[PDB]
Amino acid sequence: KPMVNESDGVTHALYPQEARLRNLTYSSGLFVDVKK
Amino acid sequence: ATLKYICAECSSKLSLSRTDAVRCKDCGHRILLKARTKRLVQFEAR
Amino acid sequence: MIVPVRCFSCGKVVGDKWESYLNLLQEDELDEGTALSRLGLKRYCCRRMILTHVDLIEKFLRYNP
Ligand SMILES: [Zn+2]
Ligand SMILES: [Zn+2]
């Protein structure tokens, strides 16, 4: 689900209303089980 | 007596000066507004 | 978006009539056409005023600070 990885803080569960105001990108993390 | 800034959600008179972060006393919600002027304003009433 | 005080066209006060009209509808279960006549809103310039207003302020109020 959407997140805001910002320095000087955790990673807030970002929301539309905020990303709009703050000029962020209402995106999210993409993770895959890389096997070596 | 007075104030300066505010928090969008947890509407609570806050404020501070330079390099005092940009957060709030509780709600991380890094937004913050700037509450009205003291100089009262006047309007043409039409 | 709050009731218009007075009718654009003839200026006849219509600010008060808001609440009354809403009642003559929900409570006194009447029909718009009538509720209006009841409130003294005769010609359409006044009728169109109340009959058409979309009280958005209500949705606005529903926000927070
Ligand atoms: Zn806060
Ligand atoms: Zn009229």
Curated annotation (Swiss-Prot), chain A:
Family label: Belongs to the RNA polymerase beta chain family.
Note: The binding of ribonucleoside triphosphate to the RNA polymerase II transcribing complex probably involves a two-step mechanism. The initial binding seems to occur at the entry (E) site and involves a magnesium ion coordinated by three conserved aspartate residues of the two largest RNA Pol II subunits. Present with 18700 molecules/cell in log phase SD medium.
The protein, known as: DNA-directed RNA polymerase II subunit RPB2
Taxonomy of the source species: Eukaryota, Fungi, Dikarya, Ascomycota, Saccharomycotina
Section covered of the full-length record: 99 to 134 of 1224
Provenance organism: Saccharomyces cerevisiae (strain ATCC 204508 / S288c)
Subunit architecture: Component of the RNA polymerase II (Pol II) complex consisting of 12 subunits.
Purpose of the protein: DNA-dependent RNA polymerase catalyzes the transcription of DNA into RNA using the four ribonucleoside triphosphates as substrates. Second largest component of RNA polymerases II which synthesizes mRNA precursors and many functional non-coding RNAs. Proposed to contribute to the polymerase catalytic activity and forms the polymerase active center together with the largest subunit. Pol II is the central component of the basal RNA polymerase II transcription machinery.
Protein encoded by which gene: RPB2
Subcellular localization, as worded in the UniProt entry: Nucleus
Swiss-Prot record, chain B:
Gene name, Swiss-Prot/TrEMBL: RPC10
Listed GO MF terms: DNA binding; DNA-directed RNA polymerase activity; zinc ion binding
Gene source species: Saccharomyces cerevisiae (strain ATCC 204508 / S288c)
Name of the featured protein: DNA-directed RNA polymerases I, II, and III subunit RPABC4
Membrane-traversing stretches: none
Family to which the UniProt record says this protein belongs: Belongs to the archaeal Rpo12/eukaryotic RPC10 RNA polymerase subunit family.
Binding site for Zn(2+): C7, C10, C24, C27
Highest taxon above the source species: Eukaryota
UniProt KW Transcription keyword: yes
Modifications the protein undergoes after translation, according to the UniProt entry: The N-terminus is blocked.
One GO term (biological process): termination of RNA polymerase III transcription
Subunit structure: Component of the RNA polymerase I (Pol I), RNA polymerase II (Pol II) and RNA polymerase III (Pol III) complexes. Component of the RNA polymerase I (Pol I) complex consisting of 14 subunits: RPA135, RPA190, RPC40, RPA14, RPB5, RPO26, RPA43, RPB8, RPA12, RPB10, RPC19, RPC10, RPA49 and RPA34. The complex is composed of a horseshoe-shaped core containing ten subunits (RPA135, RPA190, RPB5, RPO26, RPB8, RPB10, RPC10, RPA12, RPC19 and RPC40) where RPA135 and RPA190 form the DNA-binding cleft.
Curated annotation (Swiss-Prot), chain C:
Keyword Glycosyltransferase part of the UniProt annotation: no
Classification via SUPFAM superfamilies: RNA polymerase subunit RPB10
Coiled coil: none
Linked residues for Glycyl lysine isopeptide (Lys-Gly) (interchain with G-Cter in ubiquitin): K59
Cell location: Nucleus, Nucleolus
Ligand binding (Zn(2+)): C7, C10, C45, C46
Pfam families, sorted: RNA_pol_N
InterPro entries with a match to the protein in the record: RNA_pol_su_RPB10 (IPR023580), RNA_pol_suN_Zn-BS (IPR020789), RPABC5/Rpb10 (IPR000268)
GO biological process: nucleolar large rRNA transcription by RNA polymerase I; ribosome biogenesis; RNA-templated transcription; termination of RNA polymerase I transcription; termination of RNA polymerase III transcription; transcription by RNA polymerase I; transcription by RNA polymerase II; transcription by RNA polymerase III
UniProt entry keywords in alphabetical sequence: DNA-directed RNA polymerase, Isopeptide bond, Metal-binding, Nucleus, Ribosome biogenesis, Transcription, Ubl conjugation, Zinc
A molecular-function term among this protein's GO annotations: zinc ion binding
GO cellular component, one term: nucleus
Further remark: Present with 5300 molecules/cell in log phase SD medium.
Similarity remark: Belongs to the archaeal Rpo10/eukaryotic RPB10 RNA polymerase subunit family.
Function according to Swiss-Prot or TrEMBL: DNA-dependent RNA polymerases catalyze the transcription of DNA into RNA using the four ribonucleoside triphosphates as substrates. Common component of RNA polymerases I, II and III which synthesize ribosomal RNA precursors, mRNA precursors and many functional non-coding RNAs, and a small RNAs, such as 5S rRNA and tRNAs, respectively. Pol II is the central component of the basal RNA polymerase II transcription machinery. Pols are composed of mobile elements that move relative to each other. In Pol II, RBP10 is part of the core element with the central large cleft.
Protein name: DNA-directed RNA polymerases I, II, and III subunit RPABC5
Designated gene of the protein: RPB10
